[PDB]
From Swiss-Prot:
This is Protease 2A. The active site is at H15, D33, C104. Disulfide bonds: none annotated. Cysteine protease that cleaves viral polyprotein and specific host proteins. It is responsible for the autocatalytic cleavage between the P1 and P2 regions, which is the first cleavage occurring in the polyprotein. Also cleaves the host translation initiation factor EIF4G1, in order to shut down the capped cellular mRNA translation. Inhibits the host nucleus-cytoplasm protein and RNA trafficking by cleaving host members of the nuclear pores. Counteracts stress granule formation probably by antagonizing its assembly or promoting its dissassembly. It catalyses: Selective cleavage of Tyr-|-Gly bond in the picornavirus polyprotein. Zn(2+) 1 binds at C50, C52, C110, H112.
């Protein structure tokens, strides 16, 4: 679990969005596993606007933060799950690191701000949905 709170927006994994997220929907994209909903309170987070490929992510299954080197956002094949059929997920960044399904929503940050959230994983892999291209989150 986990979300980004920026301005009057809440960014979550689309597969974990709540009834309230869908009732306050701003934008969603199944191909990215992202959903953004509106909030009444002002958020606590800053979004990075950069090309960093190193950062730190929070891993809830270890209660710890880990440093990572990650690939640039790209189209990556993701096997079928209870949430989605087998498909290519876009704007995904992979890295070597521990993750389990419940880790989705953990934030990845670089020195500039929030880069993205945990969205996929594998045997010693962790994948993050990028949010740096969503310029409208800042306005
Ligand atoms: C952090 S998610 C994760 C982490 C570890 C694993 N494991 C750990 C060992 C074997 C294995 O595959 C499996 C996942 N699940 C996973 O990637 N998905 C399920 C939720 C929806 C995701 C999507 N964006 O399509 C895909
Ligand atoms: Zn950065």
């Amino acid at each position: 679990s986990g979300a980004i709170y920026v301005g009057n927006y809440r960014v979550v994994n689309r597969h974990l969005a709540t009834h309230n997220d869908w009732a306050n929907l701003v934008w969603e994209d199944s191909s990215r596993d992202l959903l953004v909903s509106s909030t009444t309170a002002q958020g606590c987070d800053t979004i990075a606007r950069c090309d960093c490929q190193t950062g730190v992510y929070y891993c809830s299954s270890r209660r710890k933060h880990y440093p990572v080197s990650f690939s640039k956002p790209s189209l990556i094949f993701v096997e079928a799950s209870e949430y989605y059929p087998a498909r290519y997920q876009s704007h995904l960044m992979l890295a070597v690191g521990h993750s389990e399904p419940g880790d989705c929503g953990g934030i990845l940050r670089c020195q500039h701000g929030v880069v993205g959230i945990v969205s996929t994983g594998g045997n010693g892999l962790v994948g993050f949905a990028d949010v740096r291209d969503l310029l409208w989150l800042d306005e």
